[PDB]
Every structure is written in C-alpha cells, then in structure tokens.
C-alpha cells in the first residue's frame, strides 16, 4: 500500500535531546510516543523503494522467434536421448513420433484413455507422476500452491470429440490443439524434449501449419521453416573423412616435460 508507513503524523526532534534525529511520533501517553515513524530502518514505517503496480510485468517476444522456438521444441520431441533426458519413461514406446488413429478423439470415458496409455506403453510415465506427487517446500503451501507433481506426456489432438474430458482426469496429461501449440507446455521449464502422443489428423497438419523448406506454410500468412546454419552436424564423421584427413599435418602427441638443469661444471 502506498499509504503504508505514512499514515502517521511525525516530525524530527532535531539536535539536542540526545536522540538520533529520526522523525518521531507526536505526543501521547502510549507506547508509540517518540518512537520512530518514517524511514526503512524503523519498526513499522515505510520500506525502501515501495513496490509499485506499474512494474513491467509482461514481455513481448517476436512472432518469428516464438514460431522458431515452437519448431525447436517440436523437433526435439522426436529424438530418443532428448526425451530420455527429460526423464519420460519411454523405453517400451514403439515409435517416438507416437501417432495413433483418429478414433482416440471419440473417447468419452477415462478407462479408454487409461487402457490406450497402457497399450501404447506410456503408463509408466503416469506412474512416475504418481510417485512424484508430494508436498511443496516453503511458503507456497499457504499461497494455494500446496501440492506439486511431474508434468507427464502431452497428447495432441486435431478436433475435440470428447478427448479432453476422457484424458483430463489423468495426472500429468495435458491437451493441446495443433493450431494452438504452446511453448509453455511443449517445453516445460525451458527444457526441450517433452514426450508427445499425436493422432494422425494432428500429425498431417504440421506440414500445413509450418510447411517444408520448399513449400511455405498454408495456414500462416508468410512463414517458412528456418534455415540450418550447419547441414551435416555429425562432426565425428566430418573429421574422420578422407577429404579432411589427407590435408592435415602429423599429430604432435609427445609430451615434453621440463628438464632438470644439472650443472655441467
């Protein structure tokens, strides 16, 4: 509050009186009488530089960078090591672009969703969410953030025929539409590699929303896939290629440590 610490009437006693020249509370037969009113050092009082509502809370990000981050988060979800290093239990998942059929959207009971997650061998991630359900540490428990858990697999659908109601009671499961993909849910915590389960109608609209490198995006106005700074990134195969290896000097891998100087005299 902007009136906090300033609702009192107080003026400094000045020099003399063997007191430290701070403003003091006016008169009265109470405890608050010459007790120190203004300033950050005093009990009660006003804090140094009070926080204001017109702080810049919000940041704006360029649309091309938001789309670029969406592409980087999506391309990292089809790689084994990157989704393993996010911790998702996908050792028995049959294919990493996990694409299912279009009758999954017609699910209306969560038993069908649980059975589908078991047949896709994805139920061990929901088990890890269940094992990771615990209480928070600190002041967040008294600020309506009492219980925490792990973000589970993300299910991506094209049209909603009941799939959000069928899947929304499972802890960890989140639902995103294809045309409304969120970076905050595709890469939780800023780290790429979340486990994703697609449907085929979901999977067949990515080339329409983002395009390939020769065909532009059809549902966006003018967006192309970004260009690669480095086409072949496997520098091991680059370096031990005969094209590079012949144009090198001999390796000087002999270690020449210091010599103890004996006196020749």
């Amino acid at each position: 509050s902007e009136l906090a610490g300033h609702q009192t009437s107080a003026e400094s006693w000045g020099t003399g009186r063997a007191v430290a020249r701070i403003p003091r509370v006016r008169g009265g037969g109470t405890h608050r009488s010459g007790q120190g009113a203004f300033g950050n050092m005093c009990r009660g009082g006003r804090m140094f530089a009070p926080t204001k509502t017109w702080r810049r809370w919000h940041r704006r990000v360029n649309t091309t960078q938001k789309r670029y981050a969406i592409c980087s988060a999506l391309a990292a979800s089809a790689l084994p090591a990157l989704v393993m290093s996010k911790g998702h239990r996908i050792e028995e998942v049959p294919e990493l672009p996990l694409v299912v059929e279009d009758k999954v959207e017609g699910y209306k009971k969560t038993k069908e969703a649980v059975l589908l997650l078991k047949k896709l061998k994805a139920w061990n991630d929901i088990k890890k969410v269940y094992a990771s359900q615990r209480m928070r540490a600190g002041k967040g428990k008294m600020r309506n953030r009492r219980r925490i858990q792990r973000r589970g697999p993300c299910v991506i659908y094209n049209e909603d025929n009941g799939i959000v109601k069928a899947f929304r009671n499972i802890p960890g499961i989140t639902l995103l539409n294809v045309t409304k993909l969120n970076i905050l849910k595709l890469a939780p915590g800023g780290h790429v590699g979340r486990f994703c389960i697609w449907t085929e109608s979901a999977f067949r609209k990515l080339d329409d929303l983002y395009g390939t490198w020769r065909k532009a995006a059809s549902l966006k106005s003018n967006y192309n896939l970004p260009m690669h700074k480095m086409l072949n990134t496997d520098l091991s195969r680059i370096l031990k290629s005969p094209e590079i290896q012949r144009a090198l000097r001999a390796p000087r891998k002999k270690i020449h440590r210091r010599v103890l100087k004996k006196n020749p005299l």
Partner: protein, 134 residues
C-alpha cells in the same frame, strides 16, 4: 479439477467457512458413513448423524467391534459424544470422549418422518445418476 468460477479453492477461505459455519451447515458437514448392511438396503452411502443413532468407531484408541448409542451431537466443537466412550478424570468423574463423525460408522439409524424422506431423496438422486450413466 474444479472449473466453477464462483467456487473458491482458497485454503484460508475454505477454512474460514468451515470453522465459522452456521449450525444447519454444520449438520451436513458432520455426516457419517453407513455400514455395508444399511448401504445395500437404503442405497445411501452417508447420512448426517442424529442423537439417537447406534454407531461404531473405526479409528483411534476406541476402535473395535463395540457399538454405542450417540449421547449427544455437540456441533460447536464439530464432534459427537457416544455412550460408552468415556474417560475418568483425576477425581473419578467420567466425561465423554469426543469422536469425529467421519471416524465412526452408523450401524442403526433412528427412523423419523424426515429421515425416511432424506433416504428416499438420496436414493432417487442416486438412481437418476445411475440412469444417466446407463
């Protein structure tokens, strides 16, 4: 997950409305489960507890196979006094040990004109939900 924008998930608000609830709301709060014999008969899972109900403790020090009549339903400390759950003081006077209604299960209801209507309302609204599911 709660989607109603007029229902609160605030911890302090829920604790305030629980601890400052009026007496007719405390009656619904202080409900007790029915036994599995009465559950299959009435198709009713839980009822608000009354003064003349026979009831059986399932949790705490006084849990067992013993069944006691409720002495009183003291809704101010959110607790009931049952017939034989009691404690000697220093001087020798016995006082009733209070048990919460959620840790005690009803074995015999006191059937009034209103509590039959409550069981019938609960049974009809359960069968409407069963018909909606089926």
């Amino acid at each position: 997950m709660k989607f109603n924008p007029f229902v609160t998930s605030d911890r302090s608000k829920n604790r305030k409305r629980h601890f400052n609830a009026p007496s007719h709301i405390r009656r619904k709060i202080m409900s007790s489960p029915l036994s599995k014999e009465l559950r299959q008969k009435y198709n009713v899972r839980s009822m608000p507890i009354r003064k003349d109900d026979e009831v059986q403790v399932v949790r705490g020090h006084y849990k067992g196979q013993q069944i006691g009549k409720v002495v009183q339903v003291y809704r101010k400390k959110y607790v009931i006094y049952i017939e034989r759950v009691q404690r000697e003081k220093a001087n020798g006077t016995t006082v009733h040990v209070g048990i919460h209604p959620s840790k005690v299960v009803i074995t015999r209801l006191k059937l009034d004109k209103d509590r039959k209507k409550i069981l019938e309302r609960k049974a009809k609204s359960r069968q409407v939900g069963k018909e909606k599911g089926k």
